[PDB]
């Protein structure tokens, strides 16, 4: 329907569970690979007989659990996480940091996957016109790899338009990344996904444990006084994310407009010339250092 294979991905700004202003992962960037229901040359696309459904529930005790649950829907090829402060710039990451810093509450996350098709690539690929046209503008050397450097991660985050950074080539590299991301999708399951972030008081969870009913089972069956945030992937935006009819309608608009809900990616330096590969790796390290949040 819509080509998402080979699209760029910003793993710093990515968020494979959603964003209130975007109907897809905010890290998804325009397609980088050029290609030829109908199978492309060098890859494969398989359709599903139904909306393949799957549910997963997990308690998110800290930002590591949140980032790990996110890593299941956006990892490197082979299940291994991307790392390097993944998703640390996404809005849904700071919101969860704020909600978990309270530390008097337990947060759970439920995921309903409604996957409709699967796409992937085999083992040396054509790239789009704009991608090669932007790579041609890239130097062979990343300046900020030199630790003595006017432009640093903290300097770039404070003022990127400062003369210290404008003298270096760093703003060039960042622009490229800001346009194309840090990775590209080599495999993807597209369709729809509904994720609930549940925020409950520890007193009520103690009450549930006293009653004997399982907290996770009660949360799955219910979707017992909680705060609910709803994140949506795929289909058309519902003007009120918290309505039963909004759910019922978006679930059917998913088929019309599916979007990647669980994908495996590959670093972009595999697509760059060998001379620029190490410089680009340094550049993406600098990018994760400057935009990501280590403290
Ligand atoms: C794109 O790649 C295919 C094989 O992946 C190749 O056959 C084709 O020639 C390439 N495109 C052009 C315009 O040559």
Numbering used by the authors: 465 to 500, 514 to 600, 605 to 704, 728 to 799
Task: Pull text from the paper.
Toxoplasma and Plasmodium are the parasitic agents of toxoplasmosis and malaria, respectively, and use perforin-like proteins (PLPs) to invade host organisms and complete their life cycles. Escape from the PV, and therefore from the infected cell, for subsequent rounds of infection has been shown to be dependent on the perforin-like protein TgPLP1 (T. gondii PLP). We report structures of the membrane attack complex/perforin (MACPF) and Apicomplexan PLP C-terminal β-pleated sheet (APCβ) domains of TgPLP1. The MACPF domain forms hexameric assemblies, with ring and helix geometries, and the APCβ domain has a novel β-prism fold joined to the MACPF domain by a short linker.
